[PDB]
Every structure is written in C-alpha cells, then in structure tokens.
C-alpha cells in the first residue's frame, strides 16, 4: 500500500506524441502575441497542432 502509486501521467518534453495529435480530450493554450506564438509560427513543421 505504501509503494505502488504511479498514474504515469507525465508529459515528457515537447516531442510527446500526445501534443502532436490534436486530440479533443485535452486543450492546449498559450498567451496571445507573445514570443512563443512567434516561435511556433516561424517553424515550418509545428503548424499542425
């Protein structure tokens, strides 16, 4: 009872496959017009999620 406790719910890095697929069970968000918005728009691959 005092050892086994592991939901294993840990998003590991950007490269996690959960982020890549735009599943509706989770919603991702950021801050408008910030630097991260520029970072994603500039990338020629990340405009899929």
């Amino acid at each position: 009872f005092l050892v086994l406790d592991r939901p294993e719910e840990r998003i590991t890095g950007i490269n996690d496959p959960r982020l890549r697929n735009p599943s509706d069970k989770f919603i991702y968000a950021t801050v408008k017009q910030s630097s991260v918005d520029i970072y994603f728009r500039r990338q020629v691959e990340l405009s899929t999620m």
Binding site: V44, E45, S47, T48
Partner: protein, 37 residues
Amino acid sequence: VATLEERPFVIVEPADPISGTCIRDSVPCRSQPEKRC
C-alpha cells in the same frame, strides 16, 4: 499518380475557404473536381 484514403497513411480533407489555397505541408489532390489538401 493514383491514390486512395487510409487514415494513418494518407489523409484527405477539404481546404479552408477563407485561405482559398492548400495549407502548407500538403499537396493538392484533385478528385475524379474540387481541390483538397
């Protein structure tokens, strides 16, 4: 080149009307005619 649709390998969806063009990282796919990405 002739092609078909299978979800994990090739995905065909209609283009965005506001953009009026195929989205990036995609190719036009004429049917056999409405352009789809």
